[PDB]
């Protein structure tokens, strides 16, 4: 079926180990910079919320182990806070920051890059809605994630998840534009699941467009049988969506011409 072949594709499984999944992601991360001696820092955008805390905790991890492991005190991680303007969420912000212990914590608030843009598209006749200029304040934050990668020997690192890869639900070339993404394959709940395990602050980890709920999407995930009408709606979006999980289309690519 459709749903079997989405699992298949993402990776997604119906029950997974807490700490065996933590250990998957964090050697992941240590063998990818054993093989590439040349990064020496991870960078990750922190806003919070229950994904990047979940991927910062992680990186920390691996860093602090390379460290012990190599003896390299060059390594680092950084954490970036890319508010845009003054954000209503600081708070969170800062016990998120407790909750991780990161090397370094960079601020770089991104409202007077995204206002300039915005300038120069008006004078030249385009006028921004709310939805566009959200996928724009998402672009802003991965321009500055990647001068910060460029300047100190780093890369990328993305929170896309099942949960939110099988919907699209993500800004092509915003949050989306990573380097390497160790979230991949957990759905919403399972991440959860992680994070009460690294003994996160439970307030840390606890809508319209995608008509349906998380619970729907991590169930259709875990191979449920969920109502008829939600499975259409969670493929629709699936198949709409194929082009942000794929590279640039050329005229050898046919997954658009069925
Ligand atoms: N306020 C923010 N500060 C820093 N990074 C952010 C912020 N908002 C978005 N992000 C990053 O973008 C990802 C997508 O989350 P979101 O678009 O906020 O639901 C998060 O996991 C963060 O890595
Ligand atoms: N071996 C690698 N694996 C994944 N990402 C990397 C690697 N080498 C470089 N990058 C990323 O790609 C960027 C270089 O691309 P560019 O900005 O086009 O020069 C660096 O700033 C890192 O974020
Ligand atoms: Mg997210």
Same mark, same amino acid.
């Given at each position: 079926?459709?749903?079997?072949?989405?699992?298949?594709?993402?990776?997604?499984?119906?029950?997974?180990?807490?700490?065996?999944?933590?250990?998957?992601?964090?050697?992941?991360?240590?063998?990818?910079?054993?093989?590439?001696?040349?990064?020496?820092?991870?960078?990750?955008?922190?806003?919070?919320?229950?994904?990047?805390?979940?991927?910062?905790?992680?990186?920390?991890?691996?860093?602090?182990?390379?460290?012990?492991?190599?003896?390299?005190?060059?390594?680092?991680?950084?954490?970036?806070?890319?508010?845009?303007?003054?954000?209503?969420?600081?708070?969170?912000?800062?016990?998120?920051?407790?909750?991780?212990?990161?090397?370094?914590?960079?601020?770089?608030? &991104?409202?007077?890059?995204? !206002?300039?843009? *915005?300038?120069?598209? %008006?004078?030249?006749?385009?006028?921004?809605? /709310? $939805?566009?200029?959200?996928?724009?304040?998402?672009?802003?934050?991965?321009?500055?994630?990647?001068?910060?990668?460029?300047?100190?020997?780093?890369?990328?690192?993305?929170?896309?998840?099942?949960?939110?890869?099988?919907?699209?639900?993500?800004?092509?070339?915003?949050?989306?534009?990573?380097?390497?993404?160790?979230?991949?394959?957990?759905?919403?709940?399972?991440?959860?699941?992680?994070?009460?395990?690294?003994?996160?602050?439970?307030?840390?980890?606890?809508?319209?467009?995608?008509?349906?709920?998380?619970?729907?999407?991590?169930?259709?995930?875990?191979?449920?049988?969920?109502?008829?009408?939600?499975?259409?709606? &969670?493929?629709?979006?699936? !198949?709409?969506? *194929?082009?942000?999980? %794929?590279?640039?289309?050329?005229?050898?690519? /046919? $997954?658009?011409?069925?």
């Amino acid at each position: 079926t459709l749903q079997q072949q989405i699992i298949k594709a993402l990776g997604a499984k119906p029950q997974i180990n807490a700490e065996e999944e933590i250990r998957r992601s964090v050697d992941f991360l240590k063998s990818y910079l054993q093989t590439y001696p040349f990064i020496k820092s991870l960078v990750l955008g922190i806003s919070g919320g229950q994904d990047s805390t979940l991927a910062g905790k992680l990186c920390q991890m691996a860093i602090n182990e390379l460290r012990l492991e190599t003896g390299n005190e060059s390594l680092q991680f950084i954490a970036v806070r890319l508010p845009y303007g003054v954000q209503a969420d600081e708070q969170d912000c800062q016990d998120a920051i407790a909750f991780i212990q990161p090397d370094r914590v960079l601020t770089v608030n &991104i409202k007077g890059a995204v !206002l300039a843009s *915005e300038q120069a598209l %008006r004078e030249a006749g385009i006028e921004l809605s /709310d $939805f566009v200029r959200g996928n724009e304040k998402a672009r802003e934050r991965m321009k500055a994630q990647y001068s910060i990668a460029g300047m100190t020997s780093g890369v990328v690192v993305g929170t896309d998840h099942a949960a939110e890869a099988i919907t699209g639900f993500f800004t092509k070339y915003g949050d989306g534009g990573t380097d390497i993404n160790p979230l991949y394959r957990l759905n919403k709940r399972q991440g959860k699941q992680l994070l009460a395990a690294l003994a996160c602050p439970e307030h840390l980890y606890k809508e319209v467009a995608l008509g349906v709920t998380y619970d729907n999407i991590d169930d259709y995930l875990e191979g449920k049988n969920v109502p008829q009408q939600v499975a259409r709606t &969670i493929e629709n979006w699936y !198949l709409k969506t *194929e082009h942000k999980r %794929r590279p640039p289309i050329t005229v050898f690519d /046919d $997954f658009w011409k069925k």
